[PDB]
Subunit: 351 residues, 4 copies
C-alpha cells in the first residue's frame, strides 16, 4: 500500500496536455492505421494494386485534405509504415499532420492470439520490446498509441478469463506508453456480432469497463493521461428488436457513467459495423443525451471516415479532389456530432 511514483509532475503534465489536445471541443480521431494485410481488402474493393506507392498515395490523399478538416481532426492514428512515409513535397507525414493541428498516433499492438481453453476467445500481443518501440516512435513524432483488444458476446463469452486477461494486457500497454511520454488509448472492443439485444450489450460493456479500470488502477495508470476507445452500446447485428438513436445513446452514456472515472480525459468511440451516417447520428445523439457526461465524447473512426473517400478515389489520380471531398464531408459531420450540433442539414431507470 505504498506509493513509488510511476510519473513525475512534468511527465503527467505532458501526458494530460496531449490527451486534451486530441479531444479538444469539436475534434476527433482519424483511424488510418490499417495494416498492409488489412488495407489489402480495401484496395481490392476498388480494383487497385496493393503496393507501397498506392498505400502512400491513399494515406496522403487523406492527410493532405484542405484546411477545413483542421478543426475537426485532433488526432490521426497511423500504421508503422505510414509513420515513415513522406508526402510528394518531401514532408514526413507526421509533419503534415502536425502542421494541420493534429496529434500523431501509432498502432503498437501485434494483433490478437487465441486463448486456449476458451470458446474462440482471444487476447492481444505486442508487449515485447514495447518500451524501446515507444521511445523510438516518440522521437519520430508520435504522441499517442493504439492497442486493440477484442471481446465477443455469446452464450459463454466474454469469459472471466478473457475479461481479466485483456484488461491486464491493456494495463501493461498503458503503463509502458506513459513511461515513454505516449498517451495510450485503451481499446476494449466488444464485437456487435450476435442476436443479443441492447440490455445485454450494456451489461457486458459495464462489466468489461469495470474490469478495465480496476486493472488500470492496479497497474498505477495515470487516467488523465489516457483515452478510452469503447464500442457504443448497441444491439447485436442479428438482433430482431429495433432501437432508436436516443436509446442507443442513453444505453451508451449510462454504461460509461457507471464505469468510467471522470478523470479520464476522453472517450473516442469506434463505429464497428455502422455506416458513415449512422456513426455520426449515434455520436450526435450520445452528445445530446440528457445526462451529465464528465469526459469528452468524440470519434475515432476508420471506415466511418474513409468509406466514401476510398470509393470516390477508385485508385484513379483524377478523382483526388472528389475523394478528399468525401472525407472532408464526414470530418465536418462528425466534428459537429461530437459537439451535439450535427444535423443532416450540415426513462433512465429503464437502463
Amino acid at each position: 500500500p505504498h506509493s513509488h511514483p510511476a510519473l513525475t509532475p512534468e511527465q503527467k503534465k505532458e501526458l494530460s496536455d496531449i490527451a486534451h489536445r486530441i479531444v479538444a471541443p469539436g475534434k476527433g480521431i482519424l483511424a488510418a492505421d490499417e495494416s498492409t494485410g488489412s488495407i489489402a481488402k480495401r484496395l481490392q474493393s476498388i480494383g487497385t494494386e496493393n503496393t507501397e506507392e498506392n498505400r502512400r498515395f491513399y494515406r496522403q490523399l487523406l492527410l493532405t485534405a484542405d484546411d477545413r478538416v483542421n478543426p475537426c481532426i485532433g488526432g490521426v492514428i497511423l500504421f508503422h509504415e505510414t509513420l515513415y512515409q513522406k508526402a510528394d513535397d518531401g514532408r514526413p507525414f507526421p509533419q503534415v499532420i502536425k502542421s494541420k493541428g493534429g496529434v500523431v498516433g501509432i498502432k503498437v499492438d501485434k494483433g490478437v492470439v487465441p486463448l486456449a481453453g476458451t470458446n474462440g476467445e482471444t487476447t492481444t500481443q505486442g508487449l515485447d520490446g514495447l518500451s524501446e518501440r515507444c521511445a523510438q516512435y516518440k522521437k519520430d513524432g508520435a504522441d499517442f498509441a493504439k492497442w486493440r483488444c477484442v471481446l465477443k458476446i455469446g452464450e459463454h463469452t466474454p469469459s472471466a478469463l478473457a475479461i481479466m486477461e485483456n484488461a491486464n494486457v491493456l494495463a501493461r500497454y498503458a503503463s509502458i506508453c506513459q513511461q515513454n511520454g505516449i498517451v495510450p488509448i485503451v481499446e476494449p472492443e466488444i464485437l456487435p456480432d450476435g442476436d443479443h439485444d441492447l440490455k445485454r450489450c450494456q451489461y457486458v460493456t459495464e462489466k468489461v469497463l469495470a474490469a478495465v479500470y480496476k486493472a488500470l488502477s492496479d497497474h498505477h495508470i495515470y487516467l488523465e493521461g489516457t483515452l478510452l476507445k469503447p464500442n457504443m452500446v448497441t444491439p447485436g447485428h442479428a438482433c430482431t428488436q429495433k432501437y432508436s438513436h436516443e436509446e442507443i445513446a442513453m444505453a451508451t452514456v449510462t454504461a460509461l457513467r457507471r464505469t468510467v472515472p471522470p478523470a479520464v480525459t476522453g472517450v473516442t468511440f469506434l463505429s464497428g459495423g455502422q455506416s458513415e451516417e449512422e456513426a455520426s447520428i449515434n455520436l450526435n445523439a450520445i452528445n445530446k443525451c440528457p445526462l451529465l457526461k464528465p469526459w469528452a465524447l468524440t470519434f475515432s473512426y476508420g471506415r466511418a471516415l474513409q468509406a466514401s473517400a476510398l470509393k470516390a478515389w477508385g485508385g484513379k489520380k483524377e478523382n483526388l479532389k472528389a475523394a478528399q471531398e468525401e472525407y472532408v464531408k464526414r470530418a465536418l459531420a462528425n466534428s459537429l456530432a461530437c459537439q451535439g450540433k450535427y444535423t443532416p442539414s450540415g426513462s433512465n431507470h429503464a437502463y
Copy 2:
C-alpha cells in the same frame, strides 16, 4: 457474463429518488447514530448519566431544532434505539425528521471485528438477517442505511486482505439494502491516524475506492441508488508537514475523480477528527476546487455538527435553546459549504 436484473425499473427509480433527495443542493446528513456504547463518553464529558431518557432528550434536542435547519438537512442517521423513540409531543422521531423535509437513515452494521493474520486490521459484521431487518426498518420509516468499514494507514496497512474483504462486505450490505428499497451509504473510512503525508493518504484512498467500486460492480450494485461516505484526503493526524485547505481540497477531489463513477449520486464526507470549523472550511474548499465534480459533494457529520450543541446543553433542560442554536449554526455553515458559499465568521503534482 449474463444478466439477471437485481432490480426492476421501478425499484431503481425509488432508490435513485431517495439518494437524490438526501443530497439535494445545499443539503447534508446529520449523523446521530451513536450507539449506547459510543454515546457513553459523550454524556460523560458533560457529566450526564447515560440513561435512555437522557439519550432520548439529546436526540430530541437535535431533531426538533427550528425550521432554519430544514434546508440544510437532507437526511438524519439514527441508531436502532432512537428509530423507535418519541419526542415529548408523542411523535415518533422518524415522523419528526420527515415533517422537517429530511430522510430517515438507520445504522445497520454490527461493529468491527479483528482480521486474523493482520496487524490489527478489521472488517465489519452485520450481514446476518440483514434483509429481514431492512424490510422492517423500511416499514418503520427508514429510507437509507449506514454501514461503516474501517481501514488504517500504516507500514503494512491497509493490507490486500483488509482492502478486499472490507470492499466485499460493503458490496454485500449494499446489495441486501437495495433489495429492500433502502439506499445504502457505502462508508469505507480510512482513519487519519499516523504521521503519513497528504500524498500517502491520497494514494491509499485511490486504491481503496478502486477496490470498493470494482466490488460494487461484481455484486451488481446500482450506483445511482447509492451514496459514498469517504474520508477527505488529508495528511496524517500527526504529520509534521503542513498543508493548506486548497491542497486538501485538490487532493480529495482528484482522488474521487480518479475512482468514483459519475453514476454515483453523491458523496457525503465524514469529518473524522476535524473540528467543526475545519470540517466546514475543507468541505467549502472541496466545492470550490477548479475541477469538474459530477456528484454532489456534501456532509454526513456527527461530531462536526454536535460538538458545540452538546457542550451548550450540558445535560441541563434549561439550555435547550442555547444548545439547538449551536447545532443550527453548524448546519447553516455546512449547508453553505457544500455549495462553496461559506466564509468563517499545478494539479499535476497530485
Copy 3:
C-alpha cells in the same frame, strides 16, 4: 506481504491434532446436525410428531449405538440444540460421543441467502458473533465446526460472483474458527441437480476448489488445521449418460489432485443424493483409485448413515435395537470403504 502470525505453534498443534483424530485411518464423520426445520421432513416421512423429545430420542439412538461403531466414527456433527441435550442416564451428548472415541462437531452457519442479480444463486450467512459462539461451543465440548455453502451447475451458474463470494465467506468462517481452537470443515457443495455430464461436474468442481484454496490463502488459513467436505464428482441427476464407479472415482480423485494442497489433513465427502449403498461403493472406489492421494479420503454422511435407521425406528422406542443395527451396518460399511476394503452383500480426465 508481511507475516503477522494468525496462530501460535501451540494453537497449530491443537488444530492439527484434532483434524488428524477425526479422519484417522478407517474413521469418518456422522453428520447429525439437521436443524429442527430440516428434521421435520424426516420425522414426517415416518408419521412422528416433531418434538424436542423425539429429536432427543432419535439422536440418542444414534449416539448410543453399540461399541462396534467406535472405530468407525471419528467425529459427530451436532445441531445447536443437540449439543446441550442429555441421554436418559443424564450424560450430556458430547460426553457420550467422546466416551466412544469420537470428536464433537457443531454446525455454525445460519443457512443460505439469495444473491441479488444472479440466476437463483446463494451465499451463506452466519459470521455475526461467530467468534463468541465458537468460544462458547469450544468450552462446551466442540472441537470442530461445519459451514455449508451451496453452488449449482446451470447454463449461467456457478457464476463468478457466486464462486468468489462463497469461497470468501468460507475463508472468513475458517479464520474465526481457528482463532478459537475449532477445526473448520470447509464445505463448498456443488449440487448434482441438472443433466450435465461427468466431465462438466469435474470442471466446475476444479474451478470451485481452486477459488476456495486461493481464498483460504488470502485469509491466512492454516490448512493442516482444516478438513474439506466436497461433493464427489458425478454426473447430474438427470444426465442420461451412464458411468461406472471407477469413472466417478477417477474424476473425483483427479479433481482433488489438481486443486487440494497436500497440507490439507483430510477430505470428508458429502453424499448428496446418493443412497447408502451407492455412497459406500463410491467412497470405496475412490480409495482404490491408483493415483496418489496425499490426504485421507473418508466420509461425512448424514442421509447415507441414517436412512435405514430412521425408517427402522419409525418413531417407535420398541424399534431401538433394529434401528441402531441399520446405522451400525452403514458405519461399518463406510469404515471399510474409506480404506478401500468394502464389498457389498487417466488422460481422458
Copy 4:
C-alpha cells in the same frame, strides 16, 4: 463456468509423459542456458575470450560427459544459439542430449522489464510470437521450455501488482507452450537478497505459489504436464540467524505442501547463490524430510553443476577430461540427493 477443452487426451498424454521423463527417479536438470550476456562474465572469470566457438566448446564439454551422467540427467536447458550448434562430430547438440537419454529444453523468455510504480520490481516478457517459436522449437528437438520471473523480498515487496502480474504472465507462457506439445517449467523465483529470516521467506514463498497456482487454474493449465522451478525456502543472504539444513528442508517442504497441488509432476529446485555442496546437501535434506511429498523433488542447477567444471577447464582444450570430471561428480552427487541418499515440531512452521 463452461469447459472448452484446451487439450485433447492425446496432447495431455504427451505432456505428462515428457514431464515424468524429465524428473524420473534419480534424475534432474542441467541448466546450461546462460544468455550470451551472462555467459560472458563466466568466460571472463577464466580469462577465456567470449566467442561463439568457445561457447560451443564449453557446452559440448558438458553435453558430452561420460555415460555416468546419463542416469543423473533427465533434461538439459539450452539457449537458442546452443540449440542449433553441433558437436565436433557434426551431431546437433539436441541429438547428443537425446542419445544420452535426456530431454531437450529451451529458454523462451526475453528477460525482465521494469514495472512502473513499484520499488524496482519487474515482470518478464517473451509472449509475442511465442506459439510460432514453440512449434519450431518442438520440430527442432525441444520438448520443454524455461521462463523465469523474478521477485524480491523487501519492506514493500513483493507487491500485490508484482505477484499478480508475474503469476499471470507465467500462466500465459504455460498455456501457449502446452498448445505446442512443450512442457512449461513454471519458474517464479524469489531472490535470497536481504536480511529477512527463514519464516519470512517461507511466508512470501507460500503467498507467491498460491497466486501462481490460482493463475494456472484461471488459464486452464494442465498441471500434470508442467513442472515447478521454485527457490528453496531459506533465510536471506544477509540474515544473522543461522539455520540447519533440516530446518531449510522443513520450511521448504512445508511451503510446497501448502500450495502445490499433487497433480504437479515435479519440482526442480534452483540453487540461487548456494555452493555446489550446499545445493546438494539441501536437496538431500529436502528429500529426507519426514513430511509427505506427492511430487518429485529434484534439481535444475546451473552454477551448482558447472562451478568446478568451468574452473577446471580454464579455457584450455587439454583440460577437457578434468573439467568434465568435475561436472560428472556434481551430477552424481545431485542424482543421489534427489533420492535422499547423499552424504558428503513441524507446527513451528
